[PDB]
Amino acid sequence: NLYSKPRNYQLELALPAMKGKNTIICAPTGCGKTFVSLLICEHHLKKFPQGQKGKVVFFANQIPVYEQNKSVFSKYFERHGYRVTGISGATAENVPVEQIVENNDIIILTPQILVNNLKKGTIPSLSIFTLMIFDECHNTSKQHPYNMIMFNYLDQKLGGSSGPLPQVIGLTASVGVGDAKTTDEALDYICKLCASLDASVIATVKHNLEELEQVVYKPQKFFRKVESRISDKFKYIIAQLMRDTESLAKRICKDLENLSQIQNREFGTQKYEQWIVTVQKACMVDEESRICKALFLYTSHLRKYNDALIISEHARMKDALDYLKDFFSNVRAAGFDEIEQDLTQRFEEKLQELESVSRDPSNENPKLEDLCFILQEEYHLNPETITILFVKTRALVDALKNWIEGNPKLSFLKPGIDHNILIATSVADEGAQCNLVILYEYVVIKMRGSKCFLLTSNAGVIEKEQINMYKEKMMNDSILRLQTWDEAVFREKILHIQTHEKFIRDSQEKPKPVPDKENKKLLCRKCKALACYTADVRVIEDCHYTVLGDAFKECFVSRPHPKPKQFSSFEKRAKIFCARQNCSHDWGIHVKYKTFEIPVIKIESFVVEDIATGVQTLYSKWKDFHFEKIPFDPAE
RNA sequence: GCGCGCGCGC
RNA sequence: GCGCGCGCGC
Ligand SMILES: [Zn+2]
């Protein structure tokens, strides 16, 4: 409802900024920080005497936030009659930018647009803005675009260049506290964030706290450490089936062990799942396709096994075995070549040991007893509770549902996936009104007597959420403390942190390096075929790398990109790959650039070989590779 | 293609 | 820092 009366706490928060102070406004998500910024932005613009005129820039980090604040600000400042506009990576690259800023009063931007136009010098000073609003301002640190912008601000403020400087405003729900393990290190971190934004005030709700607390979702947090089964023989057996089908894949693909860059994979993990993905991706489905289709069968079978171990981990062995029983029922009912019928046979040789390990009652899952008990209590306390349960995987949703309906001690419960249903089970949220929230072994609250239960067997997950709570304490205590300082004392502290930080940036400027200047071969990382030479390579727009000549065009084949994107300098037409029918390693992309159809390469697709010595070096990033970096020439 | 943030591991 | 992964940007 950002399209229609302030609560008192919005007035309280708006006040310091309305007084001309650089403020970080820190308030919970969804409490109306946006409205608060509409109030501040109205006041600022209307304050100027007739004859004078403000200009406001609002920074947004993601396209959807950009889109929605552009509509909101546009919507709101009609009747006032100010000109409202936006610029993102799409409001490009043929809009005259210093002229858009000129002819508008409220400009909504992604930060990088501004960073580029300061860097290119098209916008010479931040002085054309009278107010700057940073959404999610806690991002103003390290090398983030917000911080680059403030580096430009502070360079003007400290090195004296009048030049009036805009007021600066930041919006967040959480400021602190970085890698801090002490309350004193929390305050240093928070003081550094203010300094980064030249803020002298942190605005929080102090006087209208009790009004705020009525509308804030703050559930009672509970942590419950559970033990898992001591012996899992079901896992041992599947694990051997996974070794069986991994070795069958090595037969068809030697050096499977290097077909993905993911290391130390383990069965029954998310990370194994991702290994499977990268491998299927590194083998798209002429003669190489027949090998990759065979590999697809193996890896899609390992995926099901992998899904099954996870189900067994958190729900019951039955649930895991039934999942596989279904799957293999599909395999014969829609196939069913050599590999497939061999694979399901290897399974069937094992089905019956798995069957009896499954029904073995000493093999029951003790974690489910804990979930069950938590459920009973809540409902013999309030029989009309609405629970949402969060689990790891699509398949676990089904596991837990069958479990619930199958449990005599949950009777009583009516599961769904709004409504004649008490428990919603799901994976991610997208479709507060929930008085019970269970995170069953779920991998907290980034969105009435409500409470959140956290159930896990992992001690480190408990630890992490207790550390997080302790950080939130330190944050809130630090803020309280610094809000008691006289603003002048605080501004003097901030001034010399800025002076100190500026020195570091200016001192620690990375020296321009000596290039090695000699010609090196670029070879394919995967097959090792010679791609090209370093003397054939040219640098486009400082940061991108291309190869000259007709000789190279034969070494790569290209392939259509499903969704082609247009950036600042080029349009990503295609993905490019090695020319051999039996490698197809990802080499980079193909762009339309200044009407040229040229290839763009990533160094991580190649091995750099020294010619005379055959010695090789791997590089992840081009900026680490110090060779003679030759500028691209528009007619060469 | 490149850049930035965050999480896990050493 | 290195590796891997997630997210977002031009
Ligand atoms: Zn190759």
Coordinates of N, CA, C and O (backbone and C1' of nucleotides) in Angstrom, one line a residue, chain A residues 61 63 89 110 261 274 568 620, chain C residues 2-6 8-10:
Chain A
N61 N 19.7 -0.6 -5.5 CA 20.6 -1.6 -5.9 C 20.1 -2.6 -6.9 O 20.9 -3.2 -7.7
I63 N 17.0 -3.9 -9.9 CA 16.0 -3.4 -10.9 C 14.6 -3.3 -10.2 O 14.0 -2.3 -10.4
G89 N 20.7 0.3 -16.3 CA 21.4 -0.3 -17.4 C 20.7 -0.4 -18.6 O 21.2 -0.7 -19.7
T110 N 20.4 3.4 -10.5 CA 21.3 2.3 -9.9 C 22.7 3.0 -9.7 O 23.1 3.8 -10.6
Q261 N 34.7 -28.2 -11.6 CA 35.7 -27.5 -10.8 C 35.3 -27.6 -9.3 O 36.1 -27.2 -8.5
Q274 N 25.0 -29.8 -7.0 CA 25.6 -28.8 -7.8 C 26.7 -29.4 -8.7 O 26.9 -28.9 -9.8
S568 N 26.4 -1.7 -21.2 CA 26.9 -0.4 -21.5 C 27.6 -0.3 -22.9 O 27.3 0.6 -23.7
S620 N 42.8 -16.8 -13.0 CA 41.3 -16.6 -12.8 C 40.9 -15.3 -13.4 O 39.8 -15.2 -14.1
Chain C
rC2 P 42.9 -14.4 -4.2 O5' 43.1 -15.9 -4.1 C5' 44.2 -16.6 -4.8 C4' 44.0 -18.1 -4.4 C3' 42.8 -18.8 -4.8 O3' 42.8 -19.2 -6.2 C1' 43.0 -19.2 -2.6
rG3 P 41.5 -19.0 -7.0 O5' 40.6 -20.2 -6.6 C5' 41.0 -21.5 -7.0 C4' 40.2 -22.5 -6.1 C3' 38.7 -22.5 -6.3 O3' 38.3 -23.0 -7.5 C1' 39.1 -22.5 -4.0
rC4 P 37.2 -22.3 -8.5 O5' 35.8 -23.0 -8.1 C5' 35.7 -24.3 -7.6 C4' 34.6 -24.5 -6.6 C3' 33.4 -23.7 -6.9 O3' 32.6 -24.3 -7.9 C1' 33.9 -23.5 -4.6
rG5 P 31.5 -23.4 -8.6 O5' 30.5 -23.1 -7.4 C5' 29.3 -23.9 -7.2 C4' 28.6 -23.3 -6.0 C3' 27.8 -22.1 -6.4 O3' 26.6 -22.5 -6.9 C1' 28.9 -21.6 -4.4
rC6 P 25.8 -21.6 -7.9 O5' 25.1 -20.6 -6.8 C5' 24.1 -21.0 -5.9 C4' 23.7 -19.9 -5.0 C3' 23.3 -18.7 -5.6 O3' 22.0 -18.8 -6.1 C1' 24.8 -18.1 -4.0
rC8 P 19.3 -12.4 -8.0 O5' 20.1 -11.0 -8.0 C5' 19.7 -9.9 -7.2 C4' 20.7 -8.8 -7.3 C3' 20.9 -8.2 -8.7 O3' 19.8 -7.4 -9.1 C1' 22.9 -8.4 -7.6
rG9 P 19.8 -6.8 -10.6 O5' 21.1 -5.9 -10.6 C5' 21.2 -4.5 -10.6 C4' 22.6 -4.0 -10.8 C3' 23.0 -3.7 -12.2 O3' 22.5 -2.5 -12.5 C1' 24.7 -4.8 -11.1
rC10 P 22.0 -2.1 -14.0 O5' 23.4 -1.8 -14.8 C5' 24.2 -0.7 -14.4 C4' 25.6 -0.7 -15.1 C3' 25.5 -0.5 -16.6 O3' 26.1 0.7 -16.9 C1' 26.7 -2.5 -16.1

